[model samples]
Target chain A: MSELEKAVVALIDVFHQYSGREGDKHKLKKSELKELINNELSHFLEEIKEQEVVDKVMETLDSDGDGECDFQEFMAFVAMITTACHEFF
Target chain B: MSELEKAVVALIDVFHQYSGREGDKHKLKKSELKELINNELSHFLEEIKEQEVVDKVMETLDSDGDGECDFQEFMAFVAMITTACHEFFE
Candidate 1:
């Protein structure tokens, strides 16, 4: 209906777009996240390309300690990074 | 830029696009929020048409309770609603 509303849907779609690979399709395993980044987020943050960096990102953002990222955690991470992006740029 | 990359940058850009209307350009006053919803979010959510509904939304989502919505609060709100949308759809 609205552009922002579209974005809201987009946010979820993007997560599932990556999260819906296999095994629990609702969550994102670290490997899936790696591909998700290289595939989805490479142009957003070049640093996301490094595997080590991705490992660290996953470790820090996985607040529930499930060894993977849920949409909740990912959203917080997205908001956090977006905030910083505003601060830096 | 990659599609998702564009999306991330778009988030900030969108916030400020509406935020920079008038006073306290960093924050969104109620009227600004109203316009933003009407103009920017019209297609995604159709029920944002009511003034009272907007008030309730701002009241609930305005975590800072400053009578205005900040980007942090807005993003959290977005994430939350998005999560809900997925559950409803799936």
Candidate 2:
């Protein structure tokens, strides 16, 4: 696989690594999403210092009205961050 | 960097690898996007044999009415495909 292809797969793997740690194995609940942001996105974002931040993040990413952060929702969030990061480069 | 961080950076790096080959250094012209789809995305999609298909893809990804696929637009394309792939695994 190309480096690009591997990275694409890695995106899914990253979500599963956190999301599978608790509750629904395939979806990220609030705590799961918070953990992901705290650990995985600490550089681009602050360490999710507040619960309200997580709430706002979940609200923005929860595009389908589902309470959980499914892979689709998670990908959207990742996309936004990746794009924003790339924009300044 | 964390593995996830590396992947996010890789996503950006991959865009420049192709987008920098020609035309505007930061945006992907049709040929650049087509090459990316062919060489990099062949696993996710069939080789882009049709020019019209590239045109349509460029049109869809050109979110800001620009004629080229910038990093933001390219990331959005990658995000959509990655989500589709991950959904099946769920």
Interface RMSD score of candidate 1: 2.1
Mark the regions of model 2 whose C-alpha exceeds 4 Å error after superposition: none
User: Where does model 1 exceed 4 Å of error?
Assistant: A47-52, B46-51
Q: What share of the true interface contacts does candidate 1 keep?
A: 0.65
DockQ of each: 0.61, 0.66
Per-residue lDDT over A1-89 for candidate 1, one digit per residue giving the tens place of the 0 to 100 score: 44466567667888888889867798999888888767776555664656788789899889988889998888887788678888887
lDDT, residue B30, candidate 1: 83
Cα shift from native, residue A48, model 2 (Å): 2.8
Per-residue CA lDDT of candidate 2, range B1-90, in tens?
A: 777888888898888999999989889999999999999887888888898999998999999987999887887898888888787787
